[PDB]
Design a protein around this ligand. Sequence first.
Ligand SMILES: Nc1ncnc2c1ncn2[C@@H]1O[C@H](COP(=O)(O)OP(=O)(O)OP(=O)(O)O)[C@@H](O)[C@H]1O
Ligand SMILES: Nc1ncnc2c1ncn2[C@@H]1O[C@H](COP(=O)(O)OP(=O)(O)O)[C@@H](O)[C@H]1O
Ligand SMILES: Nc1ncnc2c1ncn2[C@@H]1O[C@H](COP(=O)(O)OP(=O)(O)O)[C@@H](O)[C@H]1O
Ligand SMILES: [Mg+2]
Ligand SMILES: [Mg+2]
Ligand SMILES: [Mg+2]
Lengths: 470, 470, 512, 48, 53, 55
Amino acid sequence: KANGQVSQVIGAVVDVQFEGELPQILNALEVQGTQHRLVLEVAQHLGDSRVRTIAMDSTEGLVRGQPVVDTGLPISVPVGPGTLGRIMNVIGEPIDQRGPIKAAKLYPIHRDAPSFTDQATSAEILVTGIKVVDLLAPYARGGKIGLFGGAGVGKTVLIQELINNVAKHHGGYSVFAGVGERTREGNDLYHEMMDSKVISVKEGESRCALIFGQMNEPPGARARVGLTGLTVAEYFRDEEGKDVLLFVDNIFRFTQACSEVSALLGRIPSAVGYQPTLATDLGALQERITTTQKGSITSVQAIYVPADDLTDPAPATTFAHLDATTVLNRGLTELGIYPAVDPLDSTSRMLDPITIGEEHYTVARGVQKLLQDYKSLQDIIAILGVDDLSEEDKLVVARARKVQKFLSQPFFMSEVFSGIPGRFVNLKQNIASFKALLEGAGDEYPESCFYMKGDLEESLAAGRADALKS
Amino acid sequence: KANGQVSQVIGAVVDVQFEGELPQILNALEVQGTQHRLVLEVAQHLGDSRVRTIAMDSTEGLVRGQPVVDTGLPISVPVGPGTLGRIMNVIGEPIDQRGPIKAAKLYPIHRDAPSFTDQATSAEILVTGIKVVDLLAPYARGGKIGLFGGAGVGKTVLIQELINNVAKHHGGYSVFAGVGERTREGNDLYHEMMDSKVISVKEGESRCALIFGQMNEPPGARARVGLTGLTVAEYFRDEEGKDVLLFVDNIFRFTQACSEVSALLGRIPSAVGYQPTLATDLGALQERITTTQKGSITSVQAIYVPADDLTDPAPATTFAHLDATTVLNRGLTELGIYPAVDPLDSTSRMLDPITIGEEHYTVARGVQKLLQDYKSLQDIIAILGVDDLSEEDKLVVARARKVQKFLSQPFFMSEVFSGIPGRFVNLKQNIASFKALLEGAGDEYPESCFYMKGDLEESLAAGRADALKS
Amino acid sequence: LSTGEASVVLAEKIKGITQQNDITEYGTVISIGDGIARVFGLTKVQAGEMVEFKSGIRGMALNLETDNVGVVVLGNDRDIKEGDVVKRTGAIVDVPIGEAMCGRVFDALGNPIDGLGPLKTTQRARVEIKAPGIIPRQSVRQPMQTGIKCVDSLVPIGRGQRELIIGDRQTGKTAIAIDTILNQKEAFNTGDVKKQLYCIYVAVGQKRSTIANLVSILKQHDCMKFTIVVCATASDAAPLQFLAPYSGCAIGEFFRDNGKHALIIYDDLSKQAVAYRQMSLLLRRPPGREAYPGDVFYLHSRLLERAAKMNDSLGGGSLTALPVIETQAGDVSAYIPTNVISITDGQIFLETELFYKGIRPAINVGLSVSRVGSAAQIKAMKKIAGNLKLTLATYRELAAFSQFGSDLDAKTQQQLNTGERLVEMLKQNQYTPMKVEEQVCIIFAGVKGFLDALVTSEVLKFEKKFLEHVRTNHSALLKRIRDSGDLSEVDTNELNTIIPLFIQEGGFKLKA
Amino acid sequence: EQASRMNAMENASKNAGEILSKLTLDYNKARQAKITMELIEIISGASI
Amino acid sequence: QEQANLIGLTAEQLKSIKENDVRARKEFLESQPKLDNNLKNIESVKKILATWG
Amino acid sequence: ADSINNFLANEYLRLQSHITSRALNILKQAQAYETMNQAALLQKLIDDATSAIDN
Ligand SMILES: Nc1ncnc2c1ncn2[C@@H]1O[C@H](COP(=O)(O)OP(=O)(O)OP(=O)(O)O)[C@@H](O)[C@H]1O
Ligand SMILES: Nc1ncnc2c1ncn2[C@@H]1O[C@H](COP(=O)(O)OP(=O)(O)O)[C@@H](O)[C@H]1O
Ligand SMILES: Nc1ncnc2c1ncn2[C@@H]1O[C@H](COP(=O)(O)OP(=O)(O)O)[C@@H](O)[C@H]1O
Ligand SMILES: [Mg+2]
Ligand SMILES: [Mg+2]
Ligand SMILES: [Mg+2]
């Protein structure tokens, strides 16, 4: 019927003038007479039959007064086994050139979070194979995980490792959502997924869904692409009931995207320019990613730290919603330690004496206390060497270096970068490895033999060989 | 007959719509139909017969169009001996539940400061009983006194001691204006003055007035309740040539309260968010608190230093108006010394060799130089220690520590915390005690006895007692 | 009461149900966005008055302008549309209060989210009410046992004060609150109404999964029977997060005015400031420093100032507040933390370094302080608490010389070791509250220096073994310390004699 | 002893200067961010 | 009739009460003393503990 | 002799406290169920009223 008419176009925000029967908020509107159909979500009713909406695609080419049709429903994206192995757009359009997606029903990307009555704990550890992770901040399936890191610190490489170790062996479906990232990784990930046989064109395979909101998309798209992929995950959680691995690339872009459009929507800037609805908008997206009685969703979410400022409102508020935390430090990367995980900043709710074995708890605190004490002395160690340091303190410093170097290990996905084969460390080997190291097993060997090693026994073989050659 | 009417209500700011004969600025308006007496102070004339006012009580319950009556005069509060020994509200209401207040007449809280020709300034030592104060920062009777302190440094307890030591045995009256502080302290002080007989129910007694603008009051009231207490002191000053003791609690709340509404009033925020009229608003209050031909006022006002940042605009401007300054340091509290009076930062306009005796001035600087030298040695002592110092420096550090610890004095208000009964130190014994230490009279005895002592003789007696004990 | 008599009263009550409806003014919404609704007309509306939309969701009229009215949507604002009807109820925001609140979980508005059944309550109090005056208050002279050794000994909390749990993320801020609720359960079982303390937990901007885990722990320990949980999650609108603190506070005033004792625990208030900031910014109000409104200080002050100790004339009730504050990088110089510290009486600083060095609860005694001081502690505690502070003070000083080394005087070695015993003594696990009388015994053995004999690694386990040994054999001793509340000389001699004796009895590492 | 001590103080004073200079850069960087933050607050309040 | 109608204690409802009484007994009797563990290894004491009941 | 004489004495009180506590718990526990049965009966009455409205 085209009851709406474009009133004004300002960047990604477009207003539409209707004669009557205004659409509800969050409803999807389609502009007519423009290739590459544009979808507009209702956000505010400015009055006088004027509604302000956000644009998902480039607004270049729009003309004031152009008609607009009211669908009467929010953006509905296809969900079901058809999305498996298929790449979707922020508005549910397939961008993989694979044909139309076969979905039983179209669910709206806007939905309320699960109630308080429908909530499950699911306190079960998730062995990822990374000793530094399983030791300090062990991930638990069905809980929320957060990866904090700056520009070029190893967030993507870490995600690829988890996918190789967890997603492949996983039984239930999976969902990958990219928000404001380089499209090259999306292409490499898709082809890499096909080569690994994780996904195939044959029907009945590819127990994993792919969603991409790469930077090429304009504002508004990177802010709602997560809801699209999240809706695909909620379907498997409630309807299918099986476990789901919701891989979410850097999410800071979502919050950033909102800020990029908040100013245009007439909102007053926040402390450092963000939108005032950052907490609520982010909360609605975060409260929906939770395990319930129907199914569990183990979400691995990356958080980009702007300018390495952890005190920024966006990442700071995210900590309160995460169960397991893994903060990546750039200082470690300079030293060559990979994965550059900060053990004193990587917090995890799963770490407690009652949930995990008491031995695992003691070994964890032993390493944290060791590194914590060493960290309290790095200042003086910089001004002057450790020679003048006390004997007991020198032992702490010496053993701290051994543990720090042993934390690093090569990844299978990062095999091309370093050039050495990856390592998969079992949980039992992880605990036993650090247990013997804290006791003073490999203290006699040089700290170099522990660099990029999988198990403690591997470092001893290298350390013993280094002593034999000389 | 009400001429005005409520037109706009947002937060604590309320606008009234008048038909004719608008009220002058600062006038008191009475709203009719409220469960509690609400008073509005005219602040700005916005034109079109509109006036913007600030509410003294909670604005909840108001209604647009509610009639407003014009009193034709600013907020008038009861003055006279009837207020002595009674708690009063910002608008003059008795909140002590002891009945109505009897006043010979009502004076306005807004008035012009006394002229310059009739200033009649005078300097007179005030023996407060505190040795550290009477020595380094002597107070002048009839001059302003500032107690700069952070959050939880001991400035509130120090005020209680000054009242216990100065207010009592005072021929004239005293006024206590507590603005913005917690109400718990108010109830404690009220019960304290009652037990200490400073206030009583029997008429003709209680030579002390109490005013409270505690946190429980909304904005605007905390910014003008201070003026109410001043009007009471001004009455006792002009009408009777009696020395008035004005004990003002933390005043930063006054400037803070103004900033809480400065935004809504239309003012542009300052460098630190304060109102542009900070200097003028503070100047109008400081100029009114001064001695004149009729009477004198010895005002003891505390300045809360948020985050221990003395560079804040509010306290920075206050230094220019104060005669005596008492800056509290948090480091001393960590050492256990009380009162934690910073000897270097604290200054007094009376600290002049011409004003006070030359001997008093000499001993004062002797201590300041001793402490200043000891502070510089802390750097080298940290790395090398006291042993590596020369004999000259060792004696400096030795006497400096004894003098620093000897500054600590237990007062009556600190008995509950420490458990040692308070003590009063005279000016003569104070100067003589420190003068002897500068000459090395106590260099032989340990530095432990020169801690929380009143007089040097008390320290020597305790030293000998410890000897016979072992 | 016979079953027939009760049924008749039940039927008679259902008979006497009145329902009156009067003309209620309504207005149209000029605009709606981000939860803010501009309403046309709807005059003679009171500030903060409750209004109902077409869908059925409520709203609070905050901004009363000559042109329109600024209303905040108290829920999801998807169904709201331009021109919709808005009916004013005629009553300020309120919430249900009573004894039935205990054992349930409600939201900011007060609706139960447990799903068990409707709330059976008849008393409703206004959310925002003027705080008590100066006369109704009373000096705090009753201890509020939290169950933590370091807290109950160094930073005593008396019923009626305000203590601030300040720290960084994952520093044990919530762990302290849980331990307190668990400790009060024992006093609830025993028939001592003078020591029962109703617990109220206000969750503001927290994931429901965490609150779900929180409630399960209370039921596990059976401590939910006397706990009230108010939930204002992140998905909840900012006004809900803004009213939830005051909402739960009104529930506490019930026990306060009724001579009872209630403990309210406000979660991170920084989240409230963001919701309050968001609510203010969307209303087109001029922002202050850090984008927060000008009267943000009045917010927390008005909320915390209500907690007080009512005098005996009103029943002697008391309301204790334990607001929590989350710091970004341990910087307490920020605006919001600085204000809250100046409002509360004492503050508990949590350090991340101490947490990872094994000092859990990671409490920085150097900065923590309480206005009430020893006025709340019991006689048997003040005597031992005083010496404990001095000993710990010296140990922190000698900490540096430990690195210096190369020599150690006989006494310094003792003071260095003695302090190490106390630090190892104050440590406490999670979900393990201790009784007040038990702490007095352990804290006593530490200051006296008996712990200097056994190795430090054996001090923590010695605590458990010692307490168990006392409860079985020395039961009369615990009763006297509990009833009388004082450590008599007879108990000192007996206690002073068994502590050295027990250490020799049990199998420990006596070599210091 | 005196020989090694002198060399140690030289290396220590050297390292002390390098770190002191590094923090100076961060101090200036933080100074610019401080003026930026405060200035935006004033503009935000002046806008309305 | 109200005697039983008001309080209709079912068989299983009273059965649970009876099990608690038995449970209290077994706990009271089977409760053995807790002394030094590795020191009470005498043939006599161990025999008594086995037949504690 | 005095160690066993005092043991049986204090043990006798512990047994007495065990019985009185058992006799009191069984009574209080039974009362708890009795109140639950009464509430369930009355709850059915309220449930019948609500169903009548629906009809
Ligand atoms: N006293 C303690 N003893 C043993 N473990 C503890 C203790 N305190 C915290 N932990 C562990 O720290 C984690 C949770 O910390 P906690 O929630 O208590 O601090 P928090 O400041 O409230 O965190 P957040 O700010 O994110 O809500 C858990 O892994 C817990 O096991
Ligand atoms: N496990 C690793 N081991 C060794 N080097 C690595 C490892 N991970 C990353 N590097 C290097 O770190 C760089 C940045 O990693 P990346 O995940 O791409 O950061 P970003 O989050 O910005 O995408 C990579 O280009 C890679 O060269
Ligand atoms: N003379 C004193 N000696 C030792 N401790 C003190 C002394 N005075 C106060 N303390 C402590 O200071 C705290 C009170 O600080 P306060 O005076 O109220 O600061 P503020 O003025 O900011 O409110 C109390 O906990 C009290 O135990
Ligand atoms: Mg990356
Ligand atoms: Mg104070
Ligand atoms: Mg917490």
